[PDB]
């Protein structure tokens, strides 16, 4: 009988989790008491 059950919400939780890891890294440089990030391109 086909299926209709849930909108399942799962694609939304993945989008929230992806934003949690992005802020957790970038919140370290906020303010004068923050930390200085370094980037290396390999060269």
């Amino acid at each position: 009988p086909k299926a209709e059950s849930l909108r399942r919400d799962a694609a939304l939780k993945v989008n929230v989790t992806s934003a949690e890891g992005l802020q957790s890294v970038l919140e370290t440089n906020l303010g004068p008491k923050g930390t200085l990030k370094m980037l290396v391109d390999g060269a």
């Binding site: 009988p1 299926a3 209709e4 059950s5």
Partner: protein
């Protein structure tokens, strides 16, 4: 159903319900097994839509009193 031992409760209740019909009456053993089995099949449309099984029971309780009155 007597020679086959049942484990899962959903089928076991139907086996115990068969003894309810068989002991009290010598006819209608197949009427209970077929009717009770179809009530769960038609209920899949309400379970899918999101209607909780609690209000599904309340609908059968109101329909049972209306059915027994018409008998």
């Amino acid at each position: 159903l007597r020679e086959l031992d049942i484990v899962h409760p959903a089928v076991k209740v139907l086996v115990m319900a068969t003894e309810q019909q068989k002991i009290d009456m010598g006819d209608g053993t197949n009427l209970v097994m077929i009717l009770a089995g179809e009530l769960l099949n038609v209920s899949e449309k309400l379970i899918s839509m999101g209607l909780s099984a609690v209000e599904i029971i309340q609908g059968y309780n109101m329909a049972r009193k209306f059915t027994l009155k018409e008998l």
